[PDB]
């Protein structure tokens, strides 16, 4: 049944995890009580990818909610679909992680991970065929970042032949909790390079820009940022949740999207960001604009190794291909020439809530290096003076471990750059 | 907006078609190996025709005709004229194909004045047969340009488009060995820019060894009381017509998944009874200098932009 | 009478299989419940259809077929489709998780754990056979199952049935209908490993069929249903001689003999005419000469290539319908002149012709119109090597940088099995050059 | 152009027309390769489970 286990960890993880389930429950007809009230059976043909069947024939998300403090966890339970979640599947502690990677990964989080894995194992064991795991988390805090990557390391140990997928929100000074966010995120990136197969870079800088230059919002809230994440996450999982000509799954996605096993960091894109549906030429133009990227890199700076785009609504399959093949042969300077058919398209007849035409795009571009460069700069600026390190060495970490993470990420930037000129 | 690659860099003619295409603001050049092109200016050798026309949504066009070597390799040109029934033919010299086919046996059946030519010039079969490559008769009695007692050949430029319309370029060129003509001393016998750009006083009785069509018309009127159209060009058009109509079903890209156009260089000799002779067919010709501008534009007009439209100087045959 | 066993592997093989056996049933008059009223020999027979159908005591006619997919969703539709009563539940074999478009994962990992069960179900059919000829194996070059599990089955069949003939129907990969970037990898791998085990293999290029559906059925975005119903006709034409009273190509050994002189060069080009839209209102029926000429237009071939620029080694013509030989030799004579048909010097320039008087059957409510006469040509021409150079360039482009190799290594394969497989293909392209140009 | 071997019946006719004349690996070797690829997987997995164990001891040392 190719089931997926979903894990949300920390403030950002559980906030943008909640919306995800709010969005796709609506798309699948499941109300805040877990009862299905839908018109089409397209809503139910692949509903076991993300939902467990209940005793009352209800649907319960295959979702594990994880935090080191219960602040955001109680707020999820009181939000719209809060009672949808299996109550045994809220796993939390009380001390928090203080925006500290070491606390999440080595001390506070080490105390709580074993119980989370009991809920993974409970969910994993009741799965006919398990594709793998989907983690939602930020990288600049402590729980989602440090404890999140700890969970990833332990899941890879218990389940090494399953796929590990993350939605990974990147920190940015424009939406900044603390000055130590580059430390937390450099450390987390080293984990993700090694221990995931596919990671969606959701950059909070791009999300703030799209909110402020484009959607005409002069002070955007986290709720506006997350509405963009909600739509991206729905579209990027459409081919998993809905029956298509494409039997998309997490392993096929990785095989076709990742040519080299460390370059698995995808740039999402969405359109549109109203009562006039867009024309297929507007979907295609907007999607591939730098202004519709959820990761804050100009794709005109590097090249697409691979791309996977999905168009949602009732539209001209021939015009999709017409317009797709158009923007390639208009901008073929920004795709690699040595991967035949590296741009793949699909269409789903079911559109997302309140949009007649939409289009989500997955991009494995080498311009993602600009994000890692940006993180790496902010990191060295502090670490050259060993500033703020006392928070980490107080939890047991050595300066050595930092130099290593810096090193592995600057390598990552090199590898991404070796293929930009290939 | 259209797409094209370039894969013969040192081609005098398509270096200029490629430059003119960029300067229309509607054509984007690519790397030699980008498969997402509309137009290919391919290699002179081993152009991979097997790979064209397999790009979804891409109309592809190429500046060569797969199989046009049947006409441009002198071994196969004779084999074509001898074997193809559309060619029986009284404008191609008596010719034989010998190997270091082949027909040395019949090569002597017609040997009772027999002076001949071989390359790829003497009177005795032994002299050149030691070059261990085609053997023709030598035009012992050519037409002479006066005053000067000169030899020359005609180069005609023929464009075939994707529809197989046969376009003769209005302008041609006379290329003389501008030295008097002798007998038997191997200077004016090979008359061009290969035993006259190193050995053989480089352009005496005219300009750059090149006498263009208006000048040569004027001489024919004054010297012979005939015209270029009547005495020569009719036979030239007949010869161009016959070869290309002969291989038309072997190379036509009319119902193919890609399409072809190609520029040819036909080379002729005129004898002293005003009879026109075919020498060889050039598959990658270089143009004459002052005409590059006007020919390299008509290519775009009828061979390129005719397939990929944007926002006469040829004789149709 | 000698029987034939059909093995459909992967999604493409199973869905094409569906189209074929539905057509076989319409052609032989077998209802969706296995009942064949015109069959008077109940529960037995050495008739010609019995080559493809065994019969049961209750009078069911049962495909001599085995369906195999590493994942159940496609064969499950057979389990519950129109012809669910047609097959033995033991004939439909489905695993748990598929090959994720990975050759090495279909051959080595997930393959090794179902190979023995498949050969067990094939053997339960090979034992119902008094004189088995061999096997007809349908599969995609491009899938992980289609490429990787097929080459494993082909290896083991040469071992259990070394004296039996193996014919492939192979779906060659096309961008405008593809499903994975790595399909060129899977293609070269399965060709190298399968070559010595296959006696004759008919390649269908999905681009050729897709364009034919567009141009001639005026379908803007052809489905797999449209693609497969057309491929059904070509396959039915090719196999009609094994299922009907005939004297051309009556056993699998005759396909090697009539079409395959050199054994590595076992990929006959197939051309088919005519393809007419069922919703073409007014339609002027085409003549014997008209459809025999079409067999020489590239736009009707199952693989786009230019056969004027190679040499033939054998040509067969299989007509279905209102065709008498006078019409044929006539059309051949006119075509021999105007077309560039060069054979090799060590082969007789000429055709082997076969005619079945029953006109082609169409799936009622399908997209093809009924026609009074149709032909399928099987030429072994060297021009088909154009498809190998297309495939080998796409493989070279990616493998220069080693793109996606790690997905194969990770299943236990070595980088050498790549450059081995590609040096094999570079030899197979040289073989075609020796035979076809001067 | 000469016809040959004209074969008729109720279903149709076959014939030939000439326009011009002319001028395995064992089961063991399979098992060997199939299983040397299973070793290559177990090795790579054992190397992974090894690196993970070194990460546990570092986690414990922190
Ligand atoms: N003509 C035709 N081609 C098909 C069909 N189904 C898939 N293909 C082609 O087959 C290739 C993909 O291989 P599949 O058969 O789908 O793969 P598979 O054997 O199921 O292998 P996995 O799904 O990787 O386990 C692509 O070329 C598809 O276009 C079909 O029904 N008809
Ligand atoms: N049948 C003939 N009659 C008279 N002169 C002839 C002749 N054949 C050759 N010639 C002489 O030889 C020269 C023609 O050269 P040719 O046509 O063979 O081209 P080529 O050998 O340079 C091949 P390429 O141009 O492709 O390098 C002329 O000067 C011409 O006088
Ligand atoms: N886009 C988005 N970013 C968030 C959200 N909540 C926190 N962040 C970002 O997450 C980082 C802080 O991590 P957080 O999730 O609060 O830490 P944790 O609770 O220790 O896991 C900072 O970079 C914030 O910008 C959210 O709801 N949406
Ligand atoms: C670049 O080459 C390819 C890339 C991806 C695939 C397919 C692959 C079967 C899978 O899973 N894809 C996918 C495609 C989407 O868009 C086309 C999409 O967007 C929702 C999505 O989400 C999971 C998944 C096939 C290819 O050939
Ligand atoms: Ca504690
Ligand atoms: Ca019977
Ligand atoms: Mg916080
Ligand atoms: Mg000349
Ligand atoms: Mg499959």
PDB file of C-alpha atoms and ligand atoms in Angstrom, chain C residues 39 41 44-45 47 49-50 55, ligand 6:
ATOM      1  CA  UNK C  39     -14.763 -25.056 -30.918  1.00  0.00           C
ATOM      2  CA  UNK C  41     -13.632 -30.475 -29.880  1.00  0.00           C
ATOM      3  CA  UNK C  44      -8.993 -30.908 -26.344  1.00  0.00           C
ATOM      4  CA  UNK C  45      -7.621 -30.336 -29.789  1.00  0.00           C
ATOM      5  CA  UNK C  47      -6.038 -27.112 -33.778  1.00  0.00           C
ATOM      6  CA  UNK C  49      -5.434 -21.758 -31.913  1.00  0.00           C
ATOM      7  CA  UNK C  50      -4.619 -24.528 -29.412  1.00  0.00           C
ATOM      8  CA  UNK C  55      -8.923 -26.099 -22.991  1.00  0.00           C
TER       9      UNK C  55
HETATM   10 CA1  LIG E   6     -10.732 -28.048 -29.291  1.00  0.00          CA
END
